[PDB]
Amino acid sequence: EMKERLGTGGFGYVLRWIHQDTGEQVAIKQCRQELSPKNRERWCLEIQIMKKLNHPNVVSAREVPDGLQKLAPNDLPLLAMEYCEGGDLRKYLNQFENCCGLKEGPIRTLLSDISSALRYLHENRIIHRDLKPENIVLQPGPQRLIHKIIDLGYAKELDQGELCTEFVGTLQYLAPELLEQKKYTVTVDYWSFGTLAFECITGFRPFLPNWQPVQWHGKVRIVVYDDLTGAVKFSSVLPTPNHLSGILAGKLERWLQCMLMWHQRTDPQNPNVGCFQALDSILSLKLLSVMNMVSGRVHTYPVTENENLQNLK
Amino acid sequence: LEQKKYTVTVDYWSFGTLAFECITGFRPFLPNWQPVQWHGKVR
């Protein structure tokens, strides 16, 4: 037999069942009380797809545990994934003292990892659509914290239609889904990621006290930052009292100012690459940083493997 | 907050909803809120 449970959404359950001996940590996404034939057949398109693919950063399926198998009252399949240890990206975002930001580079991981998970999905033209903290799992890695994007496939896979449009749990994040519109363009990942990212840097987004249809004015009467009452504020020009690198305001305000938009969002000096190119170059760079002591505390410099001391001096 | 239209008019509005409210139990609406409306004022 098998073990325990996880979270809920899409077409039902996520489960941490195990062959309770050796500890086979499998994930189980079962089905929800029948649907239209094209809506329960879409469930089966998901299963083939999250198995059709494998990329570190984004879980792959273990097929089905041959032991115990169909405890499924469906005659429809189930899905078994490689469950990752306590990393529900949220978990930490609440953590507690990431209030005011989670300035690690575990920004630099996440900003990277995902950027290369999304990668793989615009490769197979599979827009993830949603993106939240609660689909991503920072799990301990053989070197430096690998994080994986679990659970989700609301995934408008070009050519084979959409999946679901189930709309489920915490909407609080996605992009101009004033329910539907035609612009289910690639673009809408870039938006969610962006805030997701923002959020991770600091602790907000363009903003989420207020709410969803409470925003759409969020979308400004735009590429600015905003308004109060007493003290309250809702923002994207000057990214706040966080704990990042002095020179990563350097990315932020000019990355995110581009990753946080509508229709076709990009950086109008060039045709680069949306996330990848810009973020990658903004993510690499090798950074030296020389304290002073002539009390001007720090100084930091961008350095090629091609320069030495007296360059610096 | 403010604008120049502190014309008579602005009583007629409050009364109106006040009235509405009294007939029924709402107004153009107040679950949501104040700056939460201004879209209240319809697109």
Q: Residue B23 has what DSSP assignment?
A: H
* A54 and A90 share one domain: no
Does residue A274 share a domain with residue A175? yes
What is the residue whose two structure tokens read 């689909």?
Answer: A135
For tokens 């690499």, the residue is: A284
In this structure, what CATH number is given to the domain that contains residue A207?
1.10.510.10
Identify which of A248, A173, A164 has the alpha carbon closest to the alpha carbon of residue A206: A173
**A217:B39 CB<8 A:** yes
**Are A270 and A258 spatial neighbours (Cβ–Cβ below 8 Å)?**
no
Residue A2 is part of which domain span? 1-83
Closest to A200 in 3D by CA, of A127, A246, A286, A136: A136
Q: How far apart are CA A238 and CA A254, in angstroms?
A: 10
State the number of CA atoms in the 13 A half-sphere of A93 facing the CB. 22
Q: Do A214 and B32 touch (CB under 8 A)?
A: yes
Q: What determination technique applies here?
A: X-ray
Q: What is the resolution of this structure in A?
A: 3.6
Q: What is the dihedral of CA A189, A190, A192, A194, to 10 degrees?
A: 160
Listed residue (A146, A123, A154) closest to A29, CA to CA: A154
| DSSP conformational letter for A22 | T
> Residues of B with CB below 8 A from A210's CB?
36
Task: Copy the structure tokens of residue A267.
Answer: 């950086």
Q: Take residue A58 and report the two structure tokens written for it.
A: 């984004």
CA A235 to CA A218: how far, in whole Å? Answer: 9
Give the Cα separation of A307 and B13 in Å (integer): 72
CATH number of the domain to which A78 belongs: 3.30.200.20
Question: Please, which residues have CB within 8 angstroms of residue A261's CB and are 6 or more apart in sequence?
Answer: A191, A223
Q: Tell me which chain B residue has its CA closest to the CA of residue A228.
A: B35
Looking at the DSSP bridge assignments, the partners of residue A136 are A149
The answer to whether the CB of A259 falls within 8 A of the CB of A186 is: no
On whether both A62 and A128 belong to a single domain, the answer is no
DSSP element (H, E) containing A28: strand A26-28
**A28 and A103 part of one domain:** no
Asked if A210's CB is within 8 angstroms of B39's CB, the reply is no
Question: Per DSSP, what are the bridge partners of residue A289?
Answer: A300
Tokens representing A119 are 């990668």
Number of residues written out for chain A: 313
Tokens of A261: 């938009």
Interface mutation target, options B34, B39, B41, chain A, most CBs of A under 10 Å: B39
Sheet containing strand A26-28, edge to edge, reads A26-28, A80-82, A61-63
Residues of B in contact with A214 (CB under 8 A): 32, 36
Same domain, residue pair A118 and A195: yes
CB A67 within 8 A of CB A19: yes
Residues A195, A93 share a domain: yes
Q: Where are the beta strands (DSSP E) in A39-153?
A: 61-63, 80-82, 136-139, 146-149
The per-residue b/e assignment along A202-216, b for 16 or more CB within 10 angstroms, e otherwise, is bbbbbbbebeeebbe
d(CA A81, CA A149): 11
Lookup result for tokens 């990355």? A255
Closest CA to A99 of A201, A179, A171: A201
Q: Are residues A101 and A41 in the same domain?
A: no
Sign of CA dihedral A190, A185, A152, A236: positive
Q: Is A210 on the interface with B (CB under 8 A)?
A: yes
Residues recorded for chain B: 43
Q: Report the C-alpha gap between A235 and A247 in whole angstroms.
A: 20
Q: Which of residues 18-37 of B touch A (CB under 8 A)?
A: 32, 35-36
- State how far residue A54 is from chain B, nearest Cα, in angstroms: 44
What is each CA distance from A44 to A13, A28, A39, A60, in whole angstroms?
A: 15, 14, 9, 15
Distance from CA of A210 to the nearest CA of B (A): 8
Query: Phi/psi of residue A154, each to 5°?
Result: -95, 50
Residue of chain A whose alpha carbon sits nearest to that of B34: A214
Distances (CA, A) of A272 to A237, A267, A279, A280, A284: 22, 8, 10, 11, 16
- Are the CB atoms for A292 and A299 separated by under 8 Å? yes
On whether both A273 and A131 belong to a single domain, the answer is yes
Q: What is the largest CA-CA distance in chain B?
A: 32
Please indicate whether, in this complex, the C-beta atoms of A217 and B32 are within 8 angstroms of each other: no
Q: Judge residue A306's burial from the number of C-beta atoms within 10 Å of its C-beta, 0-12 exposed, 13-18 middle, 19 or more buried.
A: exposed
Q: What b/e string do you get for A47-77 counting C-beta neighbours within 10 Å, with b at 16 or more?
A: bebbeebebebbbebbebbeeeeeeeeeebb
Tell me how many residue pairs between chain A and chain B have CB atoms under 8 A apart: 8
Same-domain check for residues A149 and A239:
yes
CA nearest to A72, candidates A26, A116, A28? A28
Alpha-carbon Rg for chain A, nearest whole angstrom, is: 22
Distance between CA A218 and CA A226 in Å, rounded? 9
Q: Say if the Cβ atoms of B32 and A216 lie within 8 Å.
A: no
Q: Are residues A23 and A41 in the same domain?
A: yes
State yes or no: is A75 an active-site residue.
Answer: no
Handedness of CA A289, A294, A296, A297 (dihedral sign): positive
Separation between Cα atoms, residue B26 and residue B23, nearest integer Å: 9
Q: A36 vs A154, A261, A280, CA distance in Å?
A: 16, 35, 43
Closest CA–CA distance from residue A250 to any residue of chain B (Å): 33
Helix (H, G, I), strand (E, B) or coil at A52: helix
| Residue A169 DSSP SS3 | coil
Say how far apart CA A270 and CA A255 lie, in whole Å.
Answer: 14
Euclidean distance between CA atoms B15 and A261, whole angstroms = 41
Catalytic residue among A21, A75, A113, A130: A130
Q: Rounded to a whole number, what is the distance in angstroms from the first to the last CA of chain A?
A: 67
- Which residues in chain B have Cβ-Cβ distances shorter than 8 Å to A218? none
User: Cα separations (Å) of A136 from A92, A152, A177, A184, A301?
Assistant: 11, 9, 22, 22, 33
Do A38 and A125 fall within a single domain?
A: no
Euclidean distance between the first and the last CA atom of chain B, given in angstroms as a whole number: 20
| Best of A214, A215, A227, A234 to mutate (most B CBs within 10 Å, chain B) | A214
DSSP letter at A58?
A: B
Residues A125 and A222 in one domain: yes
